[PDB]
């Protein structure tokens, strides 16, 4: 949820509705709305890092547990 993201400093780089440093959360929700295994694909990007999908700034890997990574991915998916 929104609190889980704030506590893990997602929000320092992401807004729900707008681009700050990382893509807007809702744009991520929409890009992967169709996508198979979207949630596990996202969980993996959240824990492992990301580079090149949205622009030149890389996202550093974030130290969350598997369970939090999954809940944050499932949550972003609902921001459609
Ligand atoms: C700034 C230092 C960041 C913090 C802290 C978090 N994220 Fe991020 N994110 C950031 C950038 C610069 C990018 C784009 C990277 C790229 O590939 O171009 C991203 C991207 C994501 C994505 C989408 C990945 C994809 O393959 O499409 C997700 C789902 C995402 N970020 C989520 C996320 C969460 C849940 C965070 C809290 C733990 C978080 N990010 C931290 C920048 C930064």
Swiss-Prot record:
GO terms for molecular function: electron transfer activity; heme binding; iron ion binding. It comes from the Bacteria. Its main location: periplasm. Heme c binds at residues 10, 13-14, 59. Disulfide bonds: none annotated. Keywords: Electron transport, Heme, Iron, Metal-binding, Periplasm, Signal, Transport. Monoheme c-type cytochrome. Probable electron donor to membrane cytochrome oxidase and to periplasmic nitrite reductase. Monomer. This is Cytochrome c-552. It comes from Nitrosomonas europaea (strain ATCC 19718 / CIP 103999 / KCTC 2705 / NBRC 14298).
């Amino acid at each position: 949820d929104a609190d889980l993201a704030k506590k893990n400093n997602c929000i320092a780089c992401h807004q729900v509705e707008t681009k700050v440093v990382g893509p807007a959360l809702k744009d991520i929700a929409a890009k992967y709305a169709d996508k198979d295994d979207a949630a596990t694909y996202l969980a993996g990007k959240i824990k492992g890092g990301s580079s090149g999908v949205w622009g030149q700034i890389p996202m550093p890997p974030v130290n969350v547990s598997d369970a939090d990574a999954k809940a944050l991915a499932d949550w972003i998916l609902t921001l459609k």
